[PDB]
Design an enzyme around this catalytic site. Structure first.
Site, PDB file in Angstrom:
ATOM      1  N   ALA A 152      -8.106   6.024  -2.644  1.00 40.09           N
ATOM      2  CA  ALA A 152      -8.429   5.436  -4.256  1.00 40.09           C
ATOM      3  C   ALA A 152      -7.972   4.201  -4.075  1.00 40.09           C
ATOM      4  O   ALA A 152      -8.677   3.529  -4.397  1.00 40.09           O
ATOM      5  CB  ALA A 152      -7.424   6.707  -5.104  1.00 40.09           C
ATOM      6  N   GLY A 185      -8.332   2.594  -0.216  1.00 42.09           N
ATOM      7  CA  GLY A 185      -9.849   1.858  -0.022  1.00 42.09           C
ATOM      8  C   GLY A 185     -10.484   3.478   1.162  1.00 42.09           C
ATOM      9  O   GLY A 185      -9.578   3.964   1.079  1.00 42.09           O
ATOM     10  N   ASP A 235       6.016   9.346   0.335  1.00 41.51           N
ATOM     11  CA  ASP A 235       4.683  10.598   0.137  1.00 41.51           C
ATOM     12  C   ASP A 235       4.267  11.478   1.222  1.00 41.51           C
ATOM     13  O   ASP A 235       3.170  11.570   1.773  1.00 41.51           O
ATOM     14  CB  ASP A 235       3.349   9.846  -0.211  1.00 41.51           C
ATOM     15  CG  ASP A 235       2.031  10.373  -1.212  1.00 41.51           C
ATOM     16  OD1 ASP A 235       2.628  12.030  -1.827  1.00 41.51           O
ATOM     17  OD2 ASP A 235       0.851  10.391  -1.087  1.00 41.51           O
TER      18      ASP A 235
END
Ligand SMILES: Cn1c(NCc2ccccc2F)c(C#N)c2c(N)ncnc21
Length: 256
Positions: free
Chosen positions: A15, A17, A116
């Protein structure tokens, strides 16, 4: 394609690139190119200089599309080395957890939180060394030796720490330790413990109530389970810190 490099094959379709393998036609030097607050990502990347962190090579614009040149990891991701319902051999789990902690120690040392951490973002080179990749959610939590609390909610719900769902503001570092614990569970059990660490999630309530006779905990030897007991603590102030993880019995167990 872009200057000296050919964009041979794609390796990521996200989402943000896409990520291409760029083989230079001259030197044959192979790297990874990502194609696209991206000013923010670039200078965080330029900061990174550790063997368990994806090395930044440089940026290049082409009107609409930006190009991020980073260390290639031809080994794919940790995600691909986890067998569903099984995990991996405990010694491979320990080695990856060692490299992961080294990586998170470095980032925290330069005042950066990844935000993340999950197996999809932990890539391997050809000698299976782990690299923390994707600084698109990464931010500064310590500058001029002053900590700032976070308030943006982000990451991936099964990896995310409970304080991020509940508190207005929270410390960056316990959040990354927590997700490292979820990664350790996934490596040893080949399944994630819960969808969310919320009081409305049965499996998470089951963990707070210490029902370790249930999956995935019953697939996990008592030594690492004891470390997971210290890591997945709901109160971020009682949760183990990395220095104290480094003293854990299982962390320091010889395995082959
Ligand atoms: C396959 N692959 C990546 N995937 C992109 C990606 C996947 C998941 C999450 C974030 C994300 F960016 C890389 C990257 N970055 C990458 C790399 N640096 N060297 C070799 N292979 C790679």
């Amino acid at each position: 394609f872009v200057e000296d490099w050919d964009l041979v094959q794609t390796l990521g379709e996200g989402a943000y690139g896409e990520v291409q393998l760029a083989v230079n036609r001259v030197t044959e030097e192979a790297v990874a190119v990502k194609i696209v607050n991206i000013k923010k990502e670039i200078c965080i990347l330029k900061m990174l200089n550790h063997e368990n962190v994806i090395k930044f090579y440089g940026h290049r614009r082409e009107g609409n599309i930006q190009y991020l040149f980073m260390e290639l990891a031809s080994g794919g991701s940790l995600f691909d080395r986890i067998e569903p319902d099984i995990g991996m051999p405990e010694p491979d789990a320990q080695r990856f957890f060692h490299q992961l902690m080294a990586g998170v120690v470095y980032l925290h040392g330069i005042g950066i939180t990844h935000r993340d951490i999950k197996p999809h973002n932990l890539l391997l080179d050809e000698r299976d060394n782990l690299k923390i990749a994707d600084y698109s959610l990464a931010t500064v939590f310590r500058y001029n030796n002053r900590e700032r609390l976070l308030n943006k909610m982000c990451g991936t719900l099964p990896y995310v720490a409970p304080e991020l769902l509940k508190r207005r503001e929270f410390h960056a570092e316990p959040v990354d330790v927590w997700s490292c614990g979820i990664v350790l569970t996934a490596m040893l059990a080949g399944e994630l413990p819960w969808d969310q660490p919320s009081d409305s999630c049965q499996e998470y309530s089951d963990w707070k109530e210490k029902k370790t006779y249930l999956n995935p905990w019953k697939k996990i030897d008592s030594a690492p389970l004891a470390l997971l007991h210290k890591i997945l603590v709901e109160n971020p102030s009682a949760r183990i810190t990395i220095p104290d993880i480094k003293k854990d019995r299982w962390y320091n167990k010889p395995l082959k």
